[PDB]
Amino acid sequence: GLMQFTLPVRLCKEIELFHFDIGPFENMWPGIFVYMVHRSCGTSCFELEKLCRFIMSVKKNYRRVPYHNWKHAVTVAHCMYAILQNNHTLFTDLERKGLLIACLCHDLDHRGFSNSYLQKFDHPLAALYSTSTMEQHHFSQTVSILQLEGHNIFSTLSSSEYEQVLEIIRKAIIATDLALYFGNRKQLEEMYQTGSLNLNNQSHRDRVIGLMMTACDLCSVTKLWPVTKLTANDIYAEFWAEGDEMKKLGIQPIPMMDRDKKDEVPQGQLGFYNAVAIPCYTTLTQILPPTEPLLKACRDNLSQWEKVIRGEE
Ligand SMILES: CCOC(=O)NC(=S)Nc1cc(NC(=O)c2c(C(=O)N3CCC3)cnn2C)cc(C)n1
Numbered sequence: 001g002l003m004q005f006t007l008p009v010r011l012c013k014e015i016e017l018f019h020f021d022i023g024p025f026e027n028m029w030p031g032i033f034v035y036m037v038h039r040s041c042g043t044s045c046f047e048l049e050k051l052c053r054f055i056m057s058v059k060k061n062y063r064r065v066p067y068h069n070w071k072h073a074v075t076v077a078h079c080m081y082a083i084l085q086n087n088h089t090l091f092t093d094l095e096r097k098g099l100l101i102a103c104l105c106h107d108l109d110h111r112g113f114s115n116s117y118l119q120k121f122d123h124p125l126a127a128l129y130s131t132s133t134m135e136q137h138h139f140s141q142t143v144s145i146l147q148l149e150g151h152n153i154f155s156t157l158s159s160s161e162y163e164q165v166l167e168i169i170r171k172a173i174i175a176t177d178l179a180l181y182f183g184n185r186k187q188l189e190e191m192y193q194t195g196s197l198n199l200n201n202q203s204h205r206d207r208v209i210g211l212m213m214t215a216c217d218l219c220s221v222t223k224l225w226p227v228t229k230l231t232a233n234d235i236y237a238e239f240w241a242e243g244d245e246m247k248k249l250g251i252q253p254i255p256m257m258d259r260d261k262k263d264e265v266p267q268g269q270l271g272f273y274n275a276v277a278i279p280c281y282t283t284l285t286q287i288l289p290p291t292e293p294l295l296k297a298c299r300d301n302l303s304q305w306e307k308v309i310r311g312e313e
């Protein structure tokens with residue numbers, strides 16, 4: 001109970017920053033996650049033994065895919081950690097508990113294919129969950145792992161506190177379905193500009209947690225340029241595999257996913273930053289002023305993608 005995790009000095013300091021990269025040493029990522037729960041939540045939120053057992057089962061159930069992998073899980077949790085730490089007082093004891101767990105769990109057992117590929121493949125999971133297919137899977141896998149023996153990290157919550165935190169986690173994971181992001185951000189835009197946004201309204205909180213989830217999920221666009229650029233390679237390695245599988249079903253993939261259309265990457269990054277990333281971090285920064293570094297770093301990387309187009313790299 002007196003066993004504080006500590007990190008080497010450069011990590012200890014850099015981890016507080018939004019643009020922190022968790023590094024290539026996989027064996028340090030569990031320790032980094034625990035460090036963030038202890039600072040974000042307290043050293044008493046979770047029985048350490050149960051937490052460590054939970055983390056290692058969660059890790060085991062991420063697959064060896066180029067992008068939607070255990071490193072993505074921890075990177076997304078670290079972004080949520082930075083948001084929580086820069087907005088100390090806005091979040092309940094329960095949201096702080098739930099949201100680092102949701103982020104760690106948000107892509108459990110991902111295979112590196114979109115909902116669309118499953119629906120066109122006719123994957124069993126598309127019959128069981130008609131919308132937000134993978135995301136209902138990820139939540140389902142989260143509940144499975146919580147119900148393994150010695151894995152209930154929530155065991156000392158009351159029955160209703162338990163139900164609230166599993167409900168925070170379920171909405172949080174559903175919200176990582178980017179198809180849902182657009183409406184969620186539009187509504188947050190109106191609510192904030194007409195002045196009706198009320199953080200005491202549970203349905204409003206829900207939406208603000210969903211936008212945080214999109215922001216943390218997309219945080220590859222908010223890293224220093226060399227991190228952003230090398231991640232883009234992993235992201236496209238999955239996209240191109242999915243395009244290949246689309247061709248195998250006899251379907252021209254969208255060009256984003258076609259590996260014969262690599263030259264169009266820089267212009268597709270512009271679209272994505274313009275239609276998705278910048279609007280996301282904009283609305284987030286309006287709602288949560290201290291998250292501004294995410295917007296500023298996204299705009300830096302947009303400017304780095306325009307330089308790629310101008311043959312300046
Ligand atoms: C209905 C489908 O229609 C459409 O194409 N809409 C849209 S969102 N297209 C789209 C999205 C891109 N996304 C990214 O590059 C990306 C992601 C991302 O989308 N995901 C989902 C898994 C992680 C995360 N980080 N980064 C850099 C790029 C281009 C060229 N196009």
Ligand SMILES: [Mg+2]
Pocket residue numbers: 106107134176
């Ligand atoms: Mg996902």
Ligand SMILES: [Zn+2]
Pocket residue numbers: 072076106107176217
């Ligand atoms: Zn994700």
